[PDB]
Amino acid sequence: RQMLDRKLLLGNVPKQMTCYIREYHVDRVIKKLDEMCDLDSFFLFLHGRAGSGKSVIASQALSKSDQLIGINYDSIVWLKDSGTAPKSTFDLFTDILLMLKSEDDLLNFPSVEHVTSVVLKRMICNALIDRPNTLFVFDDVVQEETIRWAQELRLRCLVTTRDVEISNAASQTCEFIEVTSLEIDECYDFLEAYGMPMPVGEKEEDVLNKTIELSSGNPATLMMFFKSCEPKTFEKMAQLNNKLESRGLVGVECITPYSYKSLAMALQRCVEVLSDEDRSALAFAVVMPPGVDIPVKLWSCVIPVEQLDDEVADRLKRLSKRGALLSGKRMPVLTFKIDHIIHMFLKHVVDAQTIANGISILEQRLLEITVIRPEDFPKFMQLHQKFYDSL
Amino acid sequence: RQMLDRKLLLGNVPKQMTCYIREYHVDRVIKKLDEMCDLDSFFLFLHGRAGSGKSVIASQALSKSDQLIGINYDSIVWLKDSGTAPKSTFDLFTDILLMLKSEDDLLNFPSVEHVTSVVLKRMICNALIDRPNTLFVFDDVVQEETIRWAQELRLRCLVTTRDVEISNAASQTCEFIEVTSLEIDECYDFLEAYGMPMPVGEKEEDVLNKTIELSSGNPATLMMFFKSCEPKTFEKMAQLNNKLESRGLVGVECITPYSYKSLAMALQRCVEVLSDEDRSALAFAVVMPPGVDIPVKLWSCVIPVEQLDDEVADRLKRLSKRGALLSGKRMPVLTFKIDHIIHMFLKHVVDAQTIANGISILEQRLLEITVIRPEDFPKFMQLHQKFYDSL
Amino acid sequence: MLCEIECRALSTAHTRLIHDFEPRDALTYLEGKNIFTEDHSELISKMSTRLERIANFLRIYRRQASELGPLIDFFNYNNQSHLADFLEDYIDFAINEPDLLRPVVIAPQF
Amino acid sequence: MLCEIECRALSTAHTRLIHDFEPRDALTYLEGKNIFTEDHSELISKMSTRLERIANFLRIYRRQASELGPLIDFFNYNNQSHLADFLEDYIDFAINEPDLLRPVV
Ligand SMILES: Nc1ncnc2c1ncn2[C@@H]1O[C@H](COP(=O)(O)OP(=O)(O)OP(=O)(O)O)[C@@H](O)[C@H]1O
Ligand SMILES: Nc1ncnc2c1ncn2[C@@H]1O[C@H](COP(=O)(O)OP(=O)(O)OP(=O)(O)O)[C@@H](O)[C@H]1O
Ligand SMILES: [Mg+2]
Ligand SMILES: [Mg+2]
């Protein structure tokens, strides 16, 4: 247990979190990794919402057991991607060449940037002989170009990403683990862990509940809201749940371990990458009963664009498979749903006009001609007017 | 006691003050450091107001007892930060790479500027082997990126800073020591130490007390006042006092061990870093009682933004946790207070119109409405009409 | 590789390893117990001054050995046992009896 | 001198020789059975802590005795027989059998 730490540090693995461990996941990211010892050049996709906590779990999954490093894999290489430029997918590998290199001849490191991608690639798989059965953690992939090169480099990869629309790049053994929103029961544990008045009183239990709903189970913004519960008095938690329904994530922004002071700053990046036409879909998501199972047609009303309509659904599925902005279900009827955290980002992230503009369009097609059945009662989005009442 | 000096000099540690030493703090910065011999990668935050003297005491401790260097820690690395640019948090470590390097191969020092971070970091923790029990002193951290990188470098850090809002980034146990304003009794000692007339004329006594009150324990300013009383004549101290209530710190500014001629030059930097909206809170904090315990509502009157006045308190707390710009008290009632030194800076720097504008609004709130009880007597601003007449 | 404890020892007991010691004496015993290489011994064996052979022996050594065994099991044989005894004393005031290292084995040389 | 077996024993049974033992107790019995010297007993007899007297007793001892006899024949007499029994057990699981551990794990 002292050799790991040597290997973790040198593979640039981040300090594993300690005060609260997501058992079921870390224990699911280790299992799947053990199962892959023979199958060479495999992808493991630890994909989730933004700030949803994926990267922390890889820190823990490679830090709990003594097996993953030493027993199952000899060495670790953990590199943060976050590449957007077209030079980024090449630059990552230059940083993965020196990583793999010896402590000796970092002095001799040449003008590596001025070389062909056929040389950096050959140059890597030429020195990759030394370390066999080596896995490479690619914290935060945005570009499918990374997934491309890697498969050409026959690598063993753990991958933390938000958009799961890039695995398509790999024709291969792709296995997946989704970092969901923190379940209700779990959250409690998270709070207690960091030191905080637990739900006890009635009005307060009912007051502690509201909190989770707002963050809609989100560790990053569940942290930011605590690093701002400085007094730790319930009376001060209530002072703020308010601040939220009037300032979005912005007011709650509190500097913390997340590279990001605000979640809106994160999600930005999830709204830039979006297909130009898919981007327009995000704006209308705002005007919608937050956190409600609602039909496709009721959505067809606000969303831009035929005798047969199925284009609304296509946008809602794509948008749901790229930052996990929207949540769609199959049964009983094809319906999607927005999440508060995913909702406040837009409420403060869209043209103040386009909100009101969109509300008028929904009311127009409104007249037309948990078991919600907007089949004879869509005429009245009043069940959701509780939200629609808001500008 | 001759080996230390070798180690102090090579670790670039500044010589500790000799003519006046604070046994309580220096003796509290050494204690906490000894307790961390067993612990690894820890942060010690010697945080205080600008000019309090944090940096002087760190060196003081380091050089006093010889146990800290040799017994508790093998070597010392003391580096001044003061980084504002985004390249600064990287540049600090380039200066911390060569520090750690051998006298040999400073010749071979390569084009370190053109190196990837993941390399400077790996390159550092690769040579950090040859350095058992290393204590790094980071005199004057402003950015949290240095705190960030450091935690990734599993370092042992003493830290001198003004803002204690970045020490919290680190998700590891952290020990704090606050450099308070020099207590009344202490000050006396400081003067006698450098030299000053002994209490003789009851009035002279009283006047010296008033002077120690003004400079709310800011040795930097205290030094500024001292250096500039050359006549060492009381009759000339009373000429100097006046100059203050008419010229702020500006007139008192003199060459001192401080990198800064004027304290206002220092505090500047504490007003630039400030949240844009927090900057104005401070800007409107100018028109306030100086060194007087005053209620939150009385403040709600001058500060920008239903029964949501709490926003005033949030600004006053944040502003107080950034170089100790404010001094909020909890009991009996939530009240803050300004300090003269903190008062002459803003007053002589901020807009007079804002000062007036603010002084005009206060009256509106008034009409709407040490054991001060502005609960039935806030209507009256005549209590400090002495201070109130000045503008 | 060693670690802070095992390297802090080679450093604490350094005022001594300079007054009486020689890396040439240990090269044969270490090419042997499998902790060196025939370039290693070349590099430390052809050095004009001893502080060179010593600084290279302590640099090269801290990288090669899984532990600090094959250097106590040498100052013994080399009639320099007053050395291997000091280092074994230091390694003992760490694992078994903690704390006692600073008062006992560290301070008497300030 | 002893050897690796006899010295590996003084080392293996070390967690124990620290909890209950004292070199002052054995100095008289060893200046006697001819294995010490009046400077030896001086050196180990004037030591502030016991871990000092113990580390010097185990260092000095490993050099002086032709064997590990006059130290089993002592923990017996000193009511510390739970010690001399452990060490005699260890010397036997090597004296009566030609097989051990090899270079392994
Ligand atoms: N198990 C956990 N314990 C404590 N904090 C957590 C945990 N999981 C997530 N967080 C919060 O999220 C921040 C980092 O989130 P994390 O990096 O784990 O999410 P992520 O999915 O990587 O987001 P991204 O994909 O944007 O990197 C931490 O600073 C912390 O505030
Ligand atoms: N113990 C002391 N003895 C003498 N002068 C002192 C002492 N402490 C502070 N000073 C005054 O302050 C100046 C340096 O202050 P110091 O660097 O100790 O404060 P600081 O908290 O580091 O400020 P900053 O955070 O801006 O570095 C000295 O030149 C001296 O004038
Ligand atoms: Mg991350
Ligand atoms: Mg300074």
Numbering used by the authors:
A (entry chain A), B (entry chain B): 112 to 416, 424 to 487, 522 to 543
C (entry chain H): 1 to 110
D (entry chain K): 1 to 105
Quote the study that presented this structure, word for word.
In Caenorhabditis elegans (C. elegans), onset of programmed cell death is marked with the activation of CED-3, a process that requires assembly of the CED-4 apoptosome. CED-3 is synthesized as an inactive zymogen; its activation requires association with the CED-4 apoptosome. Activated CED-3 forms a holoenzyme with the CED-4 apoptosome to cleave a wide range of substrates, leading to irreversible cell death. Here, we report cryo-EM structures of the CED-4 apoptosome and three distinct CED-4/CED-3 complexes that mimic different activation stages for CED-3.
The CED-4/CED-3 catalytic complex was prepared by incubating CED-4 with a CED-3 catalytic mutant (198–503, C358A) (magenta). There were also three oligomeric states after global 3D classification, including 43.1% hexamers, 40.5% heptamers, and 16.4% octamers. In the presence of the CED-3 catalytic domain, the percentage of intact particles, that is, the heptamers and octamers, substantially increased, with the percentage of heptamers increased by about fourfolds. The 3D reconstruction of a heptamer contains a funnel-shaped density, an upper ring-like density and a globular density in the hutch. The funnel was determined to ∼ 3.6 Å resolution by applying a C7 symmetry. After local masking refinement, the resolution was improved to ∼ 6.5 Å, supporting rigid-body docking of individual CARD. The globular density in the hutch was clearly seen in both 2D and 3D classifications; however, the resolution could not be improved to support model building despite our various attempts. Six CED-4 CARDs, organized via group II stacking, and a C7 symmetric NOD funnel were resolved in the heptamer, with a height of ∼100 Å and a diameter of ∼140 Å. The heptameric architecture of NODs in the CED-4 is highly similar to that in the Apaf-1 apoptosome. Despite different oligomerization numbers, the inter-subunit interface varies little between the heptameric and octameric CED-4.
